[PDB]
Structure formats: C-alpha cells, structure tokens
Design a protein around this ligand. Structure first.
Ligand SMILES: NC(=O)c1ccc[n+]([C@@H]2O[C@H](COP(=O)([O-])OP(=O)(O)OC[C@H]3O[C@@H](n4cnc5c(N)ncnc54)[C@H](O)[C@@H]3O)[C@@H](O)[C@H]2O)c1
Ligand SMILES: Cc1cc2nc3c(=O)[nH]c(=O)nc-3n(C[C@H](O)[C@H](O)[C@H](O)COP(=O)(O)O)c2cc1C
Length: 358
C-alpha cells in the first residue's frame, strides 16, 4: 500500500517511505577518521532507499568516541565523503549525514591529547564504546569518566555543529540529521540522569533542552530548516541514559519547540515499553513536519502507523545492513538475507558489501 508512495522531506523528495537508518559500522581509516570507497560501495548498494541516513559522523575530533567512526571536520574527510555522496547521486539516491558529538560515550585514549571526554556533568556513562586493538579489530571497552563542560565552552560546541553542517553541504549530502538521541552529547544534556548542571544549561526541562535548541537555530541559519532533521529517543532508556521522571511531557516540550523552527523532520528512535497511540497522536499534533519512526519496525507495523497518519516513514536498521535492495524485497514480499551481527562493527567488506540483492 502506502509504504511505496513518494514523500517530500524538506529539500528532497523520497520515491518511497523505506529509509535506511543511521548505522555505525566502524570501517573508517585511522588516523584521520576517513570514509573509504568501500563505504562508498556500501551506500551506493542501498541507494534505492527512499532516504539514506549515514552512520553517526563526528562534528569534530573532540566528538570522537569510537575507533573507526568517520568525521566531517577535515578536508581529507570532506573530499572522501564527496565521492560517496556523488556515488549515491549517480544511482539516483538521497543521503543525509547524521552528525554527533559522543560526549561521555568515548575513551580518553582516542581523544585529542589523551584527555577526558566532555559532557554536561562529570558522570560515567557506565557503558561501553567500541575501540580497536593492535590488529585493528573492534573491541568493547569501558567508557572514560567525562569532564563537565565549562559554561564558556558551549558556544564552541554550537559552532562545531554549524561548521560540520557547512561541511555537509560542501560534501554533497542532501540533509543533515542532528544526533540528539541514544545518550550522546545532546541527549546527555537533555536527560536529568546525566545532566546535573546548576547553570542555565541544567535543571528545568527548558534548561536541559537549551543546548539542543541553540544547535537547531545555528544550523537553520547556517543552511536551512528544510535541510535539518533531528533524531530523538525521548521515551525509555538508551545506553544507560533514561529520560527522567516526566519523559512524556518533556518530550512534548522539546517537540513543540522543534516545531517552531519548522525543520524538515522528526526521527523518533524507539525501543521496554511501546509508544501509546495517545502519545503518538500528541506528537503528530505538535509537530507539522515529516515524522520518521524506527526501532524494531516491520513493513506491516509501518504500513499501519502510516495509514493511521501517525508517522510518514520508517527507517530500518538491521534489515538494511543485510538487504541492499530492501525496498524491492518489501514490495515483492521476498525473504530477507540472514543477518550477520558478528560483523556489524569493524572489519572490511565481509558482512558489509557482500550481502546479495534479489
Ligand atoms: N551511533 C549510535 O547511535 C549507536 C551505536 C551503537 C548502537 N546503538 C544502539 O544502541 C543499542 C545498544 O546496542 P549494544 O549492543 O551496544 O548494547 P548491548 O551490548 O548492551 O546489547 C547487546 C545485546 O545483544 C547481544 N549481543 C551483543 N554483543 C554480542 C556478542 N558479541 N555475542 C553474542 N551476543 C551479543 C547480547 O544478548 C546483548 O544483550 C543498539 O541496539 C543500537 O540500537 C547506537
Ligand atoms: C549496528 C548498529 C549501529 C547503529 N548505529 C546508529 C547510529 O550511528 N546512530 C543512530 O542514531 N542509531 C544507530 N543505530 C540504531 C539504528 O539507527 C536503528 O534505529 C535500529 O537499528 C532500528 O532497529 P531495527 O534494526 O530493528 O530496524 C544502530 C543500530 C545498530 C544495530
């Protein structure tokens, strides 16, 4: 039914509503956190997606928390991405870059100067990140305790998102997705759990949401609201960052503010309690742009919610890892390739560009 109809998402139009979710795969070149042609072949393979959303990409070297995640702050990086976006565009695809700062989800050993990473407050994420061993294989490691950002460092962060956005537009991407979910830097600010500041960036929900909203305004000035999407995970717990004691009302707060900027899309990452339709209707009521749902979605769950007018499209993660031509398969109701989780992270072409199409 509707899953395969067109949808305008800000400055682009997607041929269908089957989006490829951002997927950290950790195959970049170090030093330099540089995308590769292999990565290019991987994204090109999936260009039939209504929209491709790249793996999280550092806005800065300070943003880095995972060995192998690409950056978008250097000329080496921008040139490499250019080629990747070009490839997608040759296949008539569309590609958004998801930008993050990992904040406390990082390790000193991969920070500039071997320093502690930064966050809203000085509290261990109490989870793991992915680093590389001597042989360059991916390994899980306990995260380093962060340094709380000084008040006067915050403008530097906002500027980093702005500049990374300018770089996105230089590199060819059609859109930018702000990574404000999964317990990374923006979310570390949004959450009472990880934010214990007593300055204007802490306390009330308005204070906790200040950083993310200044990023949104900086990047709407820098480019356009029609080019900006944002990913939130506002209900539940993600990598040990919960959403505090009134998560639903605090979500509707941020969503109402987001609406005011008229940005292109709200990408809700789900997944542990499901979203009530009640809540879903409240979101749809407050936000006027494109709504993208993700998190253990099925083609059928997606077809429902869409028809019900509660979301406009769906991003598939794991299914996109394993099915380049996921779009065709969903429409032919074809079987999907088995997933190979042991190669989600790190490595080379095996479990990356070697999943076959129909
Ligand atoms: N850039 C990002 O925003 C980012 C990056 C990575 C993951 N994520 C999200 O964060 C969530 C947490 O993912 P996670 O896996 O890091 O948390 P996690 O490691 O706590 O959960 C992994 C679960 O999967 C299984 N599993 C994981 N590794 C395994 C292994 N080596 N062998 C056998 N079974 C294994 C285990 O049963 C385990 O309970 C993910 O589901 C994903 O949606 C986001
Ligand atoms: C291996 C892997 C890497 C991921 N990387 C990111 C990421 O970089 N940014 C992000 O917002 N979500 C990331 N996610 C979460 C996915 O975007 C997506 O929401 C999730 O996989 C959806 O569930 P599904 O796989 O059942 O479709 C990742 C998930 C997986 C499994």
């Amino acid at each position: 039914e509707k899953l395969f109809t067109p949808l305008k998402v800000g400055a682009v139009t997607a041929p269908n509503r089957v989006f490829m979710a951002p997927l950290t795969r950790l195959r970049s070149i170090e030093p330099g956190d540089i995308p590769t042609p292999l990565m290019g072949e991987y994204y090109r393979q999936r260009a039939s997606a209504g929209l491709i959303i790249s793996e999280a990409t550092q806005i800065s070297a300070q943003a880095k928390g995972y060995a192998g995640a690409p950056g978008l702050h250097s000329p080496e990086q921008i040139a490499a991405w250019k080629k990747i976006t070009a490839g997608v565009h040759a296949e008539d695809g569309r590609i958004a870059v998801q930008l993050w700062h990992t904040g406390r989800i990082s390790h000193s050993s991969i920070q500039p100067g071997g320093q502690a990473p930064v966050s809203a407050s000085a509290l261990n994420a109490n989870t793991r990140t992915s680093l590389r061993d001597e042989n360059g294989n991916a390994i899980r490691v306990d995260t380093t305790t962060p340094r709380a950002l000084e008040l006067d460092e915050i403008p530097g962060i906002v500027n980093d998102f702005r500049q990374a956005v300018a770089n996105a537009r230089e590199a060819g991407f059609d859109l930018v997705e702000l990574h404000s979910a999964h317990g990374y830097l923006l979310h570390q600010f949004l959450s009472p759990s990880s934010n214990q500041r007593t300055d204007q960036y802490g306390g009330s929900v308005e204070n906790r949401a200040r950083l993310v909203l200044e990023v949104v305004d900086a990047v709407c000035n820098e480019w356009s609201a029609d080019r900006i999407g944002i990913r939130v995970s506002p209900i539940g717990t993600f990598q040990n960052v919960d959403n505090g004691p009134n998560e639903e009302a605090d979500a509707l707060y941020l969503i109402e503010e987001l609406a005011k900027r008229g940005i292109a899309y709200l990408h809700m990452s789900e997944t542990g309690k499901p979203y009530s339709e009640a809540f879903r209707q409240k979101v749809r009521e407050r936000f006027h742009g494109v709504i993208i749902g993700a998190g253990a979605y099925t083609a059928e769950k997606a077809e429902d919610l869409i028809g019900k007018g509660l979301i406009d499209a769906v991003a598939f993660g794991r299914d996109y890892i394993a099915n380049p031509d996921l779009v065709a398969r969903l429409q032919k109701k074809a079987e999907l390739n088995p997933q190979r989780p042991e190669s989600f992270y790190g490595g080379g072409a095996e479990g990356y560009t070697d999943y076959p199409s129909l």
